[PDB]
Structures are given as C-alpha cells and as structure tokens.
Design a protein around this ligand. Structure first.
Ligand SMILES: C/C(=C\C(=O)OCCCCCCCCC(=O)O)C[C@@H]1OC[C@H](C[C@@H]2O[C@H]2[C@@H](C)[C@H](C)O)[C@@H](O)[C@H]1O
Ligand SMILES: [Zn+2]
Ligand SMILES: [Zn+2]
Length: 1028
C-alpha cells in the first residue's frame, strides 16, 4: 500500500487515477472481461460539439455512467457508443449570421458548396472541450469511434429507412396550416405568436353567396379576413343548428335562427325553418370565380360551427385556416392556395396579383359592394398577432411539405409505449401517452441547405416517385454516371437525375432536407450502418434497455426514436426511460444562456472533483426532480461523502503500515460489538443499495451509502481509535484491522458506479486490482444482526441526549463530568455491553442505568384547571396538592393514580394532574422517546483540573501534527504555563504519560524559542527539542 496524503487535492487524485486507467487499459478490460455475459444496452441522445457541454449533459452522462458501471459489476457486458448530431437548423443559422447573408438568392450567389463547407466547419469547434469534459467526468466511452450524422454511411442508413417507409406508401406530399410570417418566410410557435400581439382597426364583412337556381336567395357568411374570399371552397353549417330563410324586401337570406336578430340589419320575416343537415349539398355562387375549384361551392356540415359568432354559415378557404383545411379534406373538396410564400396573391387572382393580401382588404370590400354581394360591413377593433422579428402581420398559411403518415400506425405506437417502463411512472400515460393520443403526421421536410437530403426523386414527365435506399440504388437508377465517392449532401445529390421507370423521363430530387429529429431518431439503425454492415452488432445492440435524457425530449428524441423504429421495424426501440429535470439555480430559476446563471460542470470538476459533482447530481432528489444547484451543494457532497471516506481510508493506511498489518496473514481475532455492528451495517447497506439500484433508484442508494459512511467515520472509527493506537497486536487490534479492511474493500466496490475515482484509489491500493473490474458485492446474511443494529441505535440516542445536555450548558466534551444516569422502562437493551463506549463518548465517570427517578429528580404536582372542569372543589384540590411532598408525588407517578383526603372525604385523581420533574441540585435533564438522561453538571476543582490535563494532551497532539511529526515517535517536550496548568500537569502526570509518546516532559518557568498554543482559553508555550 502506498501512503495516503489526505490533503492531496481532488484534481491531483483524479488525474492520478486517470493515469492508472490508461496504463491498465481499464475501460477496455472492463468490457472484454464481460465477453460472454448477457448484453446490457443503452443509447445516448447524440449531442453537438458546436456548443460547450453544460450541466444538463453532466447530469445525463452521470446517470448513464452509473448504470453502465453498475450493470458491468453485476454481470453484464455494456458496450458504450457516442455520436454527434451535426445537421440541424441552428448550424445553418449560425453560418448565415457569420456570413451576413440569407435566403436562396444570396446563398447561391455565395455558392451552395462553399456554404455547405462552412456548416461542416462549424460543427466540431468545441471538440477538444468535449473530450476534456468526457474524460474528467469519468464518462467511459471511446471518443475516437463516434458515429457522426453528416457521414455518408450514417446518411445511407437513414435513406434506407426512408426508402422503406416510402415503399409502404407512408411518405407523401401535403399541406399544413400554421401561423406564418410572410416577411421572414417561416412558421412561428404559439409562444412566438403570444409575444407579438398588437391592436388594430380593420374590416369585417357579411357576404352574400347566391343559391343556384333560386330567385334572390343567399347564404350570408361573415368573415374577419376579406382577402380569403377569392379562395372560397365551401360553406359550413352545423348539422343540428336551426337556420331560417329570412325575407327582407326582395331577397331571402339564410342564417342561423339564433343569430338572425344580430346579423340581419332591419326587420325580417321568417319564411321557414331548417336544420343545418337539410342545407347540406346546396350549391351556391362564390363572390369571386377566377380561381378554379374542381370540387366545392356546396354547403357542408361540420361539428365545430357554433351559434356564437358570425352567421352560423362559415366561409372556408382551406389554405388559410386549420379548421378550413380539415373540413374541406373531410368532404373530398379541392385544396387551393392562391398566395405565395411572401403573402402575395399569385397569378390565380389576376386583379390583385403580386399585392400583399392584407393590403387588399379595402379593395375587396369595394368590389363586393360594387358587385352587390356585400350585405354589411363594420369597423373592427381588436388585437392581431405580429412578427416579433419584423412586426409584419402574421398569417394563417399552409406551406407545401412532405409528411410521414405516422397516424397510419397510431395503434402500434400505443402498443409499443405500453411496453415501456417510464420514470416517473405518470409520463407513460401522461405527457408522453397523451402526445401519442393526439398524434398528427410527421412533417419531415425542411427548406434549407444543410441536412440529410430527402431521398425522393420525382419524374418531370409523370410525377412518379423513386426513393433510392442506398448509394448503389442511386447509381443504378441515375441517367448518368455517379461516382462511388458521391457525397450524400446538397448540392451534390441535386445534380443527380434518374431515369423514370414508368416513362423513362428525367427524375429530379425534391429540394428539401429532412427534420434533424429524424436523423437522431434513426441512431439505433444508422450508428452501425445497418443493414449494409454490422448486422450481428446491431441486433445485439437493439433495443435499448434504458435511455436517460431530459423530459424535454418527450416531443423530441423520445418521440423520434419511437416513431422511426415503429415505422421501420414495428418495435419499441427502448425498454425504459429515465427522464431528467432541467437544472435550476439556487433561486429556482432554470439555468439558461441568456440569464448567465448556469454553473459550468468543468469549473465544478476543477474546484471540487468529479466524484463530488457526480454525487451532487445523484443525491437528495430523483433525476426527474429539478435540482436547485450551487457550488455549496457540491461542497457539501465533497465534505460529507468524498473527504470523509478519504480520511477514514488514510487513517487505515497510516496505522496498518505502522503496525505492519497484512490481510494475507491469519491473526488471532477477538471481535468487539463495535466490529460486529459496523460489519452488520455494511451488509445491510449492501443489501439495501442493491435493491434500490436494481430499480434505478440512485437517490435512495446514495442516501443509504451516505448514512453508512457517517456511521463508519463518526462512530466506528472514532470509538475504535484506541485499538489502532495500541502497542503490540493483540486480538482486539487485529479484529479492528480485519474489520476496517473488509469495510473499505466492500464500500469502495459499492461506491464504484457513483464516485469512480476515489472508489478505485481505495480499492486498488488495498487489493492491487481496479475496482471497476470487480463484481458488485453480495450481502453476507450471516453478518447481519438486526438485534445489534437496534441496540446500537438506542445507544446512539443516549449519546445524542448526553451531547445535547452538554451543548445546552456550554460544557465542552473535554471537560469530564461525574455521571450520566439513564432511566428506562423496558429491559430492552443490554446496557452493560456499551457502558465503556458511552462513558468514553460523553466523558462521564459513571454511567448509571436507573429504573426510578428518586435519587435524580423531585416531582412537583399542580392540578390541571383545564381538565378538572367538573370538580367544583378547587379549594380542596388546591390544599390537597399543596419529605411527605416527595413521597406523595413519587407515589402518584408510578401508580398513575392518586387518592387524597380533603377536609372530610377522599377523592381519586388520575389524568387531572400536571407533573413537573425538577432536577436535584446540580443535575440537568433531557429526554426523547423512551429515554430520559440526567447529567451531573456539578464541576469540582479536581474535575476542572482533569479537563485542563485533557486539553494539554490535545494541545500536544495538535502541535506534533503542526510540526509534522510521525505519530509513533517519542519526543522530549518542554511546557510553560500558569500555576493552574503546572499543577494540573503534575497531578495528572500518569494520564499524560499514558496518552502521549514522551521521552521526557519538563515544566519550565520560561522557554527559549517555544511556540504559544491554546490550552482551553489559557496560553501555554510548548517546545519539542533534541536531547541525547
Ligand atoms: C436537463 C437538460 C438541460 C439542463 O439541465 O440544462 C441546464 C444548463 C443549461 C445552461 C446552458 C448555458 C451554458 C453556457 C452559458 O453559461 O451561456 C436537457 C438535456 O440536456 C442534455 C441533453 C442534450 C442533448 O441534445 C439532446 C439530444 C437528446 C437531442 C437528440 O437533441 C438532453 O438530455 C437534454 O434533454
Ligand atoms: Zn418576421
Ligand atoms: Zn415518368
């Protein structure tokens, strides 16, 4: 065993262990040694090296590493794989911001290829910081062998999945309506929309839609957006609502019965009543007829039509509203869109072509009035959403896009989710399950340059679609040569055309790339270039036994993994999900870039060590409970767990080497109750931490281990130091070494998944072998002694009571007191087996176990005027409750009743008496639960003297340490002090001789070149010197 510097910094210890791991090839050995054992599989959600790692990564990688180490130690082979998610809109946006250009014209003016190369360059800028973070956190993985989503082989596997999906007919071109900025040409989120409202005055109109082949009858439709009127496709009514034919002069208007008084201006006669279902299929004339709608201009019924707004008859334009889109499609009516991506009318609306639609509202209302189809108009004051980024007005707009018809497999999604164990449980049928229940199809295409190209080619002749699954298929179908080296990115693949298998015309690739969530959801198949290679490795690494990422992946990676795998294989790609809460600052605010309140994990590792950071990320709350993180939280883990272990470990190594202890020898062993207690607690801890870890309960396993470490240091080691300091090697000393040796070996194994650096420092020094090649320890049931555990815990309650009495009266522990006395009802605990440990801990001369109070307390008895409500003889209970007083009170305490005689009669008291235990002169009392402790706080000259001598001893031990003297050396000591110090030292000379290693001790009047130290509040000069 090498010596231990308990003051060695964490950074130095962890770098030393890291060097052992490289020298011993320990990570790779930990995997090879499990060749043949069952496989345990985990997937990491691939991060990106265009940003620095943050404490969110540190939380998730600590949890994955704990699981991997634990499953390795319990008999599994755990292959570790990392990857980089390199496509993704932020990459492209960062290059646009760096170059100062945007939009298709400027990027192509710049050169697509050159633009693509900047994106490539931007994604690994922080690779070196990622390597340092990964290594220093102790997250074992080969960073020379990542998968990378921009590599051809990765992309080729993604194309293979997409082509398989296309084969099933599940990949289609469609439209989806969303809030949309016509200036930025992008769809905004609800949160983005909520940020940008603004108040406006515009026009709403009630429009006449003439009924075909009737005399002067019209549906009336109300709208807030006149510019959608040239694109009318249908009128919707509610099946069950009541409608009237209302006559006004020469015309008849059809509106809802309940809205007619509001919507019609002036009086009307009701000609007839109709349910909306009777209006279904009625043909009408639209207000404009230049846009072609092949199927439409009829009334349809739809449940969302209400009696609370408009006329009850709703104009539908399917490209400018989500309900409009759905209802038109439900009825098999034509989809039309007469507005371009800039919010401008196309050539399909000739009189307004090229103008921004909202700018045309006034001109359309003038046209309606000029054409006699405007029934009513009014000024409208309301709030309208604008673009935070340019305050252009927003629009409801349908872009054309590619979709995967995931809804076609909704039932398989739900079945696969049912097979997953979620942590916490409620995510399964809550956040995640409800997202599945409300599934819409996956909008897969993106109109940008950097990303996985969507591998769909369309014939310019007949629009037939071919989707190459591979480079070989691309080359086979291409109408020209395609080199083996073709890069699967834009623009290279846009220059490849195929021969249409239907008509032999030219096929051109659709221009879009795919959603980055599809790349990362494809990682179970693409990470190993499946099915082109590695089919055995893939099958062994599918599905994952566990993943662990933030709960924000509910609609992200958790969903894209499930969706890609369900589409491709039908199967769930993971068996369990550990969800993580986003880390908070000490104020409970989420850590974010903009606020500057994040704590860098590499900073925290440098200050406190990775063991302490990992512990702080695992302890005191579950992974899915957001942590209020601070440096103080890491410091507490370092002090309570890391440093405490290191100090116990260094104590063992120091004394084992001094005494030449060797676990290989057989010694005569007399084990004490303390030895048996800590070995029992150790195996109880093994048992309980294992159960928790089997269920992924790191928090409770951490808690169990921390309690053990505290008991080990604060009770077992503290109350056994005398056996280690002893001269010789009797049976009780050998038992101490034997016991603490086993404790440290087993505890370092237990800790190995949590705190892998210090665990291996302890284990390798004691055993010569890396802890990370060990098996997780087994509980030895024969060393579990629940009776001893329950006994020692009662002993600890009494120690706590004694200490609290001392603290209450400011009586230092070094100051001996005459006695502690304990009064117990039950003969529950064998107190004589722990008397010496109790007297040592509490520094009392006598420990008395009492069944009674008599010698210790007197009882004062009052009547309880609150409970003695009935008894009207309060003058009698006053005199009856006012030597003989001591005898009568002790009598009523034990018997729990009382019989006092009034002025003539006798009454029977019970629970109507308030009792006061008054400590006798010089005693102080405290109680909890079953136990009452009474401390004799009376100091005497001789007790005070002995305390002074105990403080001299401790001052000498401290000074020897400050001089860095070995603990086994004998010294010549000079001491100078006041007359009380001189006299205490002479009187307790043999106590000093027995507790200090001394060649001589000279009390001198004055000392040359001594050092002044504190003995209590006294100043004493000490000198250590040489003498022949
Ligand atoms: C718990 C989380 C963040 C957190 O706790 O963040 C707290 C710290 C944020 C502070 C940022 C500011 C740092 C710099 C500064 O000071 O300015 C969320 C998790 O993040 C980690 C992982 C990210 C992977 O990419 C996701 C993959 C799965 C997907 C395919 O893309 C993932 O598990 C994610 O769910
Ligand atoms: Zn905008
Ligand atoms: Zn064709």
């Amino acid at each position: 065993m090498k010596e231990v510097n308990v003051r060695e910094s964490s950074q130095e210890r962890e770098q030393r262990i890291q060097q052992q791991w490289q020298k011993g090839n320990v990570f790779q050995q930990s995997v090879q040694n499990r060749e043949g054992y069952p496989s345990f599989v985990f997937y990491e959600g691939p991060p990106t090296a265009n940003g620095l790692p943050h404490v969110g990564h540190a939380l998730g990688r600590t949890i994955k590493d704990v699981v991997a180490r634990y499953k390795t130690m319990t008999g599994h082979q755990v292959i570790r794989k990392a990857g980089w998610d390199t496509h993704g809109l932020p990459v492209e946006l960062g290059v646009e911001k760096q170059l100062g250009i945007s939009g298709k014209h400027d990027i192509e003016k710049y050169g697509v290829e050159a633009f693509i190369n900047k994106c490539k360059e931007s994604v690994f800028v922080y690779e070196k910081q990622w390597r340092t973070f990964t290594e220093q956190l102790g997250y074992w993985v080969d960073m020379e062998d990542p998968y990378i989503t921009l590599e051809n082989s990765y992309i080729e596997s993604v194309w293979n999945v997409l082509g398989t999906i296309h084969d099933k007919g599940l990949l289609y071109k469609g439209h989806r309506v969303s809030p949309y900025c016509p200036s930025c040409q992008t769809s905004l989120s609800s949160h983005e929309v909520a940020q940008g409202y603004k108040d406006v005055k515009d026009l709403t109109v009630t429009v006449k839609f003439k009924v075909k082949n009737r005399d002067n009858e019209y549906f009336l439709g109300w709208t807030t957006t006149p510019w959608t009127l040239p694109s009318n496709v249908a009128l919707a009514v509610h099946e069950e609502m009541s409608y009237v034919r209302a006559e006004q002069g020469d015309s008849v208007y059809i509106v809802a019965e309940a809205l007619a008084d509001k919507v019609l201006k002036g009086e009307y006669s009701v000609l007839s009543h109709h349910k909306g279902n009777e209006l279904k299929g009625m043909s009408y004339e639209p207000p404009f007829n230049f846009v072609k709608v092949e199927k439409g201009h009829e009334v349809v019924t739809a449940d969302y039509v209400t009696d609370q707004s408009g006329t009850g008859v709703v104009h539908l334009a399917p490209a400018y509203g989500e309900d409009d889109y759905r209802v038109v499609k439900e009825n098999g009516f034509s989809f039309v869109n007469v507005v371009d991506e800039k919010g401008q009318y196309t050539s399909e609306v000739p009189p307004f072509q090229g103008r921004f639609v909202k700018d045309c509202d006034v001109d359309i209302v003038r046209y309606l009035a000029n054409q006699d189809v405007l029934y009513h108009k009014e000024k409208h004051e309301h709030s309208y959403p604008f673009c935070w980024r340019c305050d252009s007005p927003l629009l409801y707009y349908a872009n054309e896009s590619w979709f995967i018809q995931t809804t076609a497999l909704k039932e398989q999604f739900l079945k696969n989710n049912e097979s997953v164990k979620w942590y916490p449980d409620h995510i399964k049928h809550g956040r995640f399950g409800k997202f599945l229940e409300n599934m819409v199809d996956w909008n897969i295409s993106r109109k940008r340059y950097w990303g996985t190209p969507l591998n769909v080619w369309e014939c310019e002749g007949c629009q037939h679609q071919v989707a190459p699954k591979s480079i070989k298929e691309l080359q086979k179908h291409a109408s020209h040569y395609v080199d083996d080296s073709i890069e699967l990115h834009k623009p290279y693949v846009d220059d490849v055309q195929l021969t249409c298998p239907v008509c032999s015309g030219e096929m051109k690739r659709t221009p879009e790339v795919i959603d980055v969530w599809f790349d990362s959801g494809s990682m179970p198949f693409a990470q190993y270039h499946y099915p082109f290679e590695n089919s055995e490795l893939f099958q062994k690494q599918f599905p994952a036994d566990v993943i662990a990422e933030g709960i924000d992946q509910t609609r992200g990676w958790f969903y894209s993994l499930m969706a890609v795998s369900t589409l491709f294989t039908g199967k769930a790609p993971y068996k369990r999900v550990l969800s993580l809460g986003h880390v908070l600052d000490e104020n409970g605010q989420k850590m974010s870039k903009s606020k500057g309140n994040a704590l860098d994990p590499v900073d925290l590792i440098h200050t406190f060590g990775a063991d302490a950071l990992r512990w702080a990320l695992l302890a005191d709350s579950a992974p899915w409970n957001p942590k209020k993180f601070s440096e103080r939280v890491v410091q507490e883990a370092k002090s309570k767990v890391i440093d405490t272990l290191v100090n116990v470990y260094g104590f063992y190594v120091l004394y084992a080497k001094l005494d030449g202890y060797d676990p290989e020898q057989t010694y005569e062993l007399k084990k004490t109750k303390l030895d048996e207690w800590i070995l029992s607690r150790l195996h109880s801890t093994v048992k309980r931490a294992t159960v928790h870890l089997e269920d992924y309960g790191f928090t409770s396993a951490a808690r169990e281990i921390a309690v053990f470490i505290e008991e080990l240091s604060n009770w077992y080691v503290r109350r056994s130091r005398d056996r280690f300091w002893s001269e010789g090697m009797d049976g009780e000393k050998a038992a101490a070494y034997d016991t603490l040796h086993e404790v440290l070996v087993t505890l370092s194994q237990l800790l190995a998944p949590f705190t892998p650096f210090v665990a291996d420092d302890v284990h390798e020094n004691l055993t010569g072998k890396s802890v990370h090649l060990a098996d997780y320890p087994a509980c030895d049931q024969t060393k579990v002694n629940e009776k001893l555990e329950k006994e020692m815990a009662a002993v600890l309650q009494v120690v706590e009571l004694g200490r609290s009495i001392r603290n209450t009266h400011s009586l230092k522990v070094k100051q001996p007191l005459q006695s502690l006395s304990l009064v117990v009802t039950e003969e529950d605990v064998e107190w004589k087996a722990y008397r010496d440990v109790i007297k040592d801990e509490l520094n009392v001369k006598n420990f008395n176990v009492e069944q009674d109070d008599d010698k210790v307390l007197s009882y004062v008895l009052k009547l309880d005027f609150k409970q003695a409500g009935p008894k009207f003889g309060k003058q009698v209970n006053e005199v009856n409750q006012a030597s003989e007083e001591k005898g009568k009170e002790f009598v009523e305490q034990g018997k729990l009743s009382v019989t006092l005689a009034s002025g003539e009669n006798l009454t029977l008291e019970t629970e109507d008496v308030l009792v006061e235990k008054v400590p006798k002169e010089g005693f102080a009392v405290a109680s909890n639960g079953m136990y009452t402790a009474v401390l004799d706080t009376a100091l005497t000259e001789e007790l005070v003297q002995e305390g002074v001598a105990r403080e001299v001893i401790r001052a000498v031990q401290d000074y020897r340490k400050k001089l860095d003297l070995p603990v086994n050396s004998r010294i010549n000591l000079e001491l100078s002090g006041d007359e009380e110090v001189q006299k205490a030292v002479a009187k307790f000379e043999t106590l000093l001789q027995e507790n200090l290693l001394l060649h001589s001790l000279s009390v001198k009047e004055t000392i040359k070149n001594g050092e002044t130290v504190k003995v209590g509040t006294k100043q004493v000069v000490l000198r250590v010197l040489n003498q022949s």
